[PDB]
């Protein structure tokens, strides 16, 4: 099996450790871990394109979209590779991640290894919003914490 870890950090209180595991090179990817320091409620959770040696959330930029699709939720047919939907934070600011996804992969041509995991200020509207921006980013507001998705050491 192949494994990865992303350490989420930002300029504020938001931080977390996210794990990835893929047991077969074309198998589903499981994603788990906890993020603390969040406001209660939904927060967009995305793999962004940025793979260069930049500091922080600054350049993370657009969603990881190697197939040039529109933005969606993780269960939508039309989605970016990086569209992992929302995570939910409880009253003391902790969001537990538990995701199984069929579109991301840790191996092959469009592997998410080296790309940037991002947790957002607000909910992702899942591409169902009333403007073109919804179909690009899901209108999830600022990037609160980010980290490179690295092969586990
Ligand atoms: Cu995003
Ligand atoms: Zn590059
Ligand atoms: Zn870059
Ligand atoms: Zn390609
Ligand atoms: Zn997207």
PDB file of C-alpha atoms and ligand atoms in Angstrom:
ATOM      1  CA  UNK A   1       0.000   0.000   0.000  1.00  0.00           C
ATOM      2  CA  UNK A   2       1.075   3.598  -0.599  1.00  0.00           C
ATOM      3  CA  UNK A   3       0.716   6.219   2.147  1.00  0.00           C
ATOM      4  CA  UNK A   4       1.003   9.984   2.443  1.00  0.00           C
ATOM      5  CA  UNK A   5       0.759  12.644   5.116  1.00  0.00           C
ATOM      6  CA  UNK A   6      -0.025  16.342   4.870  1.00  0.00           C
ATOM      7  CA  UNK A   7       0.761  18.639   7.820  1.00  0.00           C
ATOM      8  CA  UNK A   8      -1.675  21.534   7.676  1.00  0.00           C
ATOM      9  CA  UNK A   9      -0.392  24.913   8.970  1.00  0.00           C
ATOM     10  CA  UNK A  10      -1.254  28.596   8.457  1.00  0.00           C
ATOM     11  CA  UNK A  11      -0.855  32.092   9.894  1.00  0.00           C
ATOM     12  CA  UNK A  12      -3.705  31.546  12.374  1.00  0.00           C
ATOM     13  CA  UNK A  13      -4.762  28.772  14.809  1.00  0.00           C
ATOM     14  CA  UNK A  14      -5.757  26.145  12.222  1.00  0.00           C
ATOM     15  CA  UNK A  15      -3.580  23.039  12.179  1.00  0.00           C
ATOM     16  CA  UNK A  16      -3.882  19.331  11.570  1.00  0.00           C
ATOM     17  CA  UNK A  17      -2.327  16.079  10.399  1.00  0.00           C
ATOM     18  CA  UNK A  18      -4.003  14.338   7.463  1.00  0.00           C
ATOM     19  CA  UNK A  19      -3.246  10.761   6.368  1.00  0.00           C
ATOM     20  CA  UNK A  20      -3.818   9.109   3.013  1.00  0.00           C
ATOM     21  CA  UNK A  21      -3.708   5.406   2.124  1.00  0.00           C
ATOM     22  CA  UNK A  22      -4.187   3.575  -1.172  1.00  0.00           C
ATOM     23  CA  UNK A  23      -3.876  -0.209  -1.022  1.00  0.00           C
ATOM     24  CA  UNK A  24      -3.845  -0.761  -4.819  1.00  0.00           C
ATOM     25  CA  UNK A  25      -2.370   1.633  -7.457  1.00  0.00           C
ATOM     26  CA  UNK A  26      -5.876   1.970  -9.007  1.00  0.00           C
ATOM     27  CA  UNK A  27      -7.756   1.461  -5.717  1.00  0.00           C
ATOM     28  CA  UNK A  28      -9.710   3.971  -3.638  1.00  0.00           C
ATOM     29  CA  UNK A  29      -7.814   6.426  -1.435  1.00  0.00           C
ATOM     30  CA  UNK A  30      -8.749   6.699   2.232  1.00  0.00           C
ATOM     31  CA  UNK A  31      -8.174  10.068   3.904  1.00  0.00           C
ATOM     32  CA  UNK A  32      -8.366  10.682   7.667  1.00  0.00           C
ATOM     33  CA  UNK A  33      -7.128  12.836  10.528  1.00  0.00           C
ATOM     34  CA  UNK A  34      -8.092  15.840  12.604  1.00  0.00           C
ATOM     35  CA  UNK A  35      -7.962  19.572  12.127  1.00  0.00           C
ATOM     36  CA  UNK A  36      -8.223  21.909  15.124  1.00  0.00           C
ATOM     37  CA  UNK A  37      -8.650  25.659  15.555  1.00  0.00           C
ATOM     38  CA  UNK A  38     -11.621  25.861  13.173  1.00  0.00           C
ATOM     39  CA  UNK A  39     -14.874  27.748  13.553  1.00  0.00           C
ATOM     40  CA  UNK A  40     -17.840  25.442  14.111  1.00  0.00           C
ATOM     41  CA  UNK A  41     -19.459  24.336  10.841  1.00  0.00           C
ATOM     42  CA  UNK A  42     -18.484  23.302   7.300  1.00  0.00           C
ATOM     43  CA  UNK A  43     -15.078  24.035   5.781  1.00  0.00           C
ATOM     44  CA  UNK A  44     -14.044  23.400   2.186  1.00  0.00           C
ATOM     45  CA  UNK A  45     -11.327  20.745   1.858  1.00  0.00           C
ATOM     46  CA  UNK A  46      -9.404  20.593  -1.418  1.00  0.00           C
ATOM     47  CA  UNK A  47      -6.264  19.399  -3.165  1.00  0.00           C
ATOM     48  CA  UNK A  48      -4.877  22.514  -4.900  1.00  0.00           C
ATOM     49  CA  UNK A  49      -2.562  22.512  -7.875  1.00  0.00           C
ATOM     50  CA  UNK A  50       0.463  24.202  -6.317  1.00  0.00           C
ATOM     51  CA  UNK A  51       3.512  21.943  -6.316  1.00  0.00           C
ATOM     52  CA  UNK A  52       6.413  24.446  -6.140  1.00  0.00           C
ATOM     53  CA  UNK A  53       8.510  25.350  -3.069  1.00  0.00           C
ATOM     54  CA  UNK A  54       6.372  28.260  -1.859  1.00  0.00           C
ATOM     55  CA  UNK A  55       5.819  29.287   1.748  1.00  0.00           C
ATOM     56  CA  UNK A  56       2.320  28.959   3.199  1.00  0.00           C
ATOM     57  CA  UNK A  57      -1.132  29.233   1.637  1.00  0.00           C
ATOM     58  CA  UNK A  58      -0.144  32.167  -0.610  1.00  0.00           C
ATOM     59  CA  UNK A  59       0.284  30.513  -4.008  1.00  0.00           C
ATOM     60  CA  UNK A  60      -1.863  27.349  -3.508  1.00  0.00           C
ATOM     61  CA  UNK A  61      -4.081  28.849  -6.169  1.00  0.00           C
ATOM     62  CA  UNK A  62      -6.513  26.819  -8.260  1.00  0.00           C
ATOM     63  CA  UNK A  63      -7.867  23.400  -7.569  1.00  0.00           C
ATOM     64  CA  UNK A  64      -5.938  20.425  -8.858  1.00  0.00           C
ATOM     65  CA  UNK A  65      -7.711  19.941 -12.192  1.00  0.00           C
ATOM     66  CA  UNK A  66      -5.581  17.861 -14.566  1.00  0.00           C
ATOM     67  CA  UNK A  67      -8.629  16.799 -16.643  1.00  0.00           C
ATOM     68  CA  UNK A  68      -9.891  20.392 -17.124  1.00  0.00           C
ATOM     69  CA  UNK A  69     -13.353  19.868 -15.576  1.00  0.00           C
ATOM     70  CA  UNK A  70     -15.681  22.169 -13.631  1.00  0.00           C
ATOM     71  CA  UNK A  71     -15.851  22.233  -9.832  1.00  0.00           C
ATOM     72  CA  UNK A  72     -18.160  19.841  -7.955  1.00  0.00           C
ATOM     73  CA  UNK A  73     -18.642  17.834  -4.788  1.00  0.00           C
ATOM     74  CA  UNK A  74     -16.690  14.598  -4.398  1.00  0.00           C
ATOM     75  CA  UNK A  75     -19.654  12.446  -5.471  1.00  0.00           C
ATOM     76  CA  UNK A  76     -20.477  14.540  -8.552  1.00  0.00           C
ATOM     77  CA  UNK A  77     -19.636  13.167 -11.993  1.00  0.00           C
ATOM     78  CA  UNK A  78     -18.336  16.610 -12.956  1.00  0.00           C
ATOM     79  CA  UNK A  79     -15.579  17.600 -10.532  1.00  0.00           C
ATOM     80  CA  UNK A  80     -11.950  18.513 -10.269  1.00  0.00           C
ATOM     81  CA  UNK A  81      -9.582  15.778  -9.081  1.00  0.00           C
ATOM     82  CA  UNK A  82      -8.954  17.879  -5.956  1.00  0.00           C
ATOM     83  CA  UNK A  83     -12.629  18.267  -4.958  1.00  0.00           C
ATOM     84  CA  UNK A  84     -12.933  16.536  -1.597  1.00  0.00           C
ATOM     85  CA  UNK A  85     -15.990  18.497  -0.439  1.00  0.00           C
ATOM     86  CA  UNK A  86     -16.384  19.772   3.135  1.00  0.00           C
ATOM     87  CA  UNK A  87     -15.209  18.755   6.587  1.00  0.00           C
ATOM     88  CA  UNK A  88     -17.274  19.612   9.670  1.00  0.00           C
ATOM     89  CA  UNK A  89     -15.825  21.258  12.808  1.00  0.00           C
ATOM     90  CA  UNK A  90     -17.589  20.824  16.155  1.00  0.00           C
ATOM     91  CA  UNK A  91     -18.137  23.423  18.870  1.00  0.00           C
ATOM     92  CA  UNK A  92     -14.530  23.428  20.198  1.00  0.00           C
ATOM     93  CA  UNK A  93     -13.132  23.705  16.682  1.00  0.00           C
ATOM     94  CA  UNK A  94     -12.129  20.136  15.806  1.00  0.00           C
ATOM     95  CA  UNK A  95     -12.981  18.581  12.431  1.00  0.00           C
ATOM     96  CA  UNK A  96     -12.483  14.840  12.000  1.00  0.00           C
ATOM     97  CA  UNK A  97     -11.757  13.824   8.436  1.00  0.00           C
ATOM     98  CA  UNK A  98     -12.961  10.469   7.135  1.00  0.00           C
ATOM     99  CA  UNK A  99     -13.149  10.251   3.359  1.00  0.00           C
ATOM    100  CA  UNK A 100     -12.970   7.474   0.766  1.00  0.00           C
ATOM    101  CA  UNK A 101     -12.419   8.772  -2.763  1.00  0.00           C
ATOM    102  CA  UNK A 102     -12.274   7.134  -6.220  1.00  0.00           C
ATOM    103  CA  UNK A 103     -10.826  10.034  -8.233  1.00  0.00           C
ATOM    104  CA  UNK A 104      -7.660  11.023  -6.357  1.00  0.00           C
ATOM    105  CA  UNK A 105      -4.663   8.679  -6.543  1.00  0.00           C
ATOM    106  CA  UNK A 106      -1.221   8.458  -4.899  1.00  0.00           C
ATOM    107  CA  UNK A 107       0.380   6.844  -7.996  1.00  0.00           C
ATOM    108  CA  UNK A 108       0.642   7.378 -11.738  1.00  0.00           C
ATOM    109  CA  UNK A 109       0.402  10.410 -14.042  1.00  0.00           C
ATOM    110  CA  UNK A 110      -1.854  12.662 -11.952  1.00  0.00           C
ATOM    111  CA  UNK A 111      -0.813  11.620  -8.464  1.00  0.00           C
ATOM    112  CA  UNK A 112      -1.752  14.056  -5.673  1.00  0.00           C
ATOM    113  CA  UNK A 113       1.649  13.549  -4.039  1.00  0.00           C
ATOM    114  CA  UNK A 114       3.499  16.848  -4.118  1.00  0.00           C
ATOM    115  CA  UNK A 115       0.302  18.879  -4.453  1.00  0.00           C
ATOM    116  CA  UNK A 116      -1.108  21.150  -1.707  1.00  0.00           C
ATOM    117  CA  UNK A 117      -3.894  20.170   0.680  1.00  0.00           C
ATOM    118  CA  UNK A 118      -5.975  23.154   1.800  1.00  0.00           C
ATOM    119  CA  UNK A 119      -8.707  23.716   4.414  1.00  0.00           C
ATOM    120  CA  UNK A 120     -10.908  26.790   3.862  1.00  0.00           C
ATOM    121  CA  UNK A 121     -12.628  29.497   5.888  1.00  0.00           C
ATOM    122  CA  UNK A 122     -16.153  28.675   4.668  1.00  0.00           C
ATOM    123  CA  UNK A 123     -18.237  25.916   3.160  1.00  0.00           C
ATOM    124  CA  UNK A 124     -17.672  24.687  -0.376  1.00  0.00           C
ATOM    125  CA  UNK A 125     -20.968  25.191  -2.296  1.00  0.00           C
ATOM    126  CA  UNK A 126     -20.127  22.080  -4.334  1.00  0.00           C
ATOM    127  CA  UNK A 127     -20.405  23.887  -7.661  1.00  0.00           C
ATOM    128  CA  UNK A 128     -24.130  24.390  -7.151  1.00  0.00           C
ATOM    129  CA  UNK A 129     -23.836  28.123  -6.524  1.00  0.00           C
ATOM    130  CA  UNK A 130     -25.280  30.958  -8.548  1.00  0.00           C
ATOM    131  CA  UNK A 131     -22.119  32.285 -10.278  1.00  0.00           C
ATOM    132  CA  UNK A 132     -19.195  31.104 -12.427  1.00  0.00           C
ATOM    133  CA  UNK A 133     -16.893  31.307  -9.379  1.00  0.00           C
ATOM    134  CA  UNK A 134     -18.892  28.467  -7.826  1.00  0.00           C
ATOM    135  CA  UNK A 135     -17.874  26.332 -10.841  1.00  0.00           C
ATOM    136  CA  UNK A 136     -14.167  27.206 -10.277  1.00  0.00           C
ATOM    137  CA  UNK A 137     -13.598  27.249  -6.466  1.00  0.00           C
ATOM    138  CA  UNK A 138     -16.928  26.522  -4.728  1.00  0.00           C
ATOM    139  CA  UNK A 139     -16.800  29.922  -2.967  1.00  0.00           C
ATOM    140  CA  UNK A 140     -15.132  28.499   0.190  1.00  0.00           C
ATOM    141  CA  UNK A 141     -13.377  31.766   1.194  1.00  0.00           C
ATOM    142  CA  UNK A 142      -9.810  32.124   2.436  1.00  0.00           C
ATOM    143  CA  UNK A 143      -7.213  29.384   2.809  1.00  0.00           C
ATOM    144  CA  UNK A 144      -6.763  28.880   6.569  1.00  0.00           C
ATOM    145  CA  UNK A 145      -4.121  26.167   6.528  1.00  0.00           C
ATOM    146  CA  UNK A 146      -2.253  24.167   3.925  1.00  0.00           C
ATOM    147  CA  UNK A 147       0.454  21.593   3.467  1.00  0.00           C
ATOM    148  CA  UNK A 148       2.239  19.491   0.901  1.00  0.00           C
ATOM    149  CA  UNK A 149       0.994  15.934   0.474  1.00  0.00           C
ATOM    150  CA  UNK A 150       4.186  13.940   1.087  1.00  0.00           C
ATOM    151  CA  UNK A 151       4.956  10.229   0.910  1.00  0.00           C
ATOM    152  CA  UNK A 152       5.011   8.851   4.456  1.00  0.00           C
ATOM    153  CA  UNK A 153       8.465   8.662   6.133  1.00  0.00           C
TER     154      UNK A 153
HETATM  155 CU1  LIG B   1      -9.864  25.309  -2.375  1.00  0.00          CU
HETATM  156 ZN1  LIG B   2       5.684  21.679 -11.690  1.00  0.00          ZN
HETATM  157 ZN1  LIG B   3       3.883  27.032  -8.555  1.00  0.00          ZN
HETATM  158 ZN1  LIG B   4      -2.324  14.393 -17.620  1.00  0.00          ZN
HETATM  159 ZN1  LIG B   5     -12.704  22.245  -7.429  1.00  0.00          ZN
END
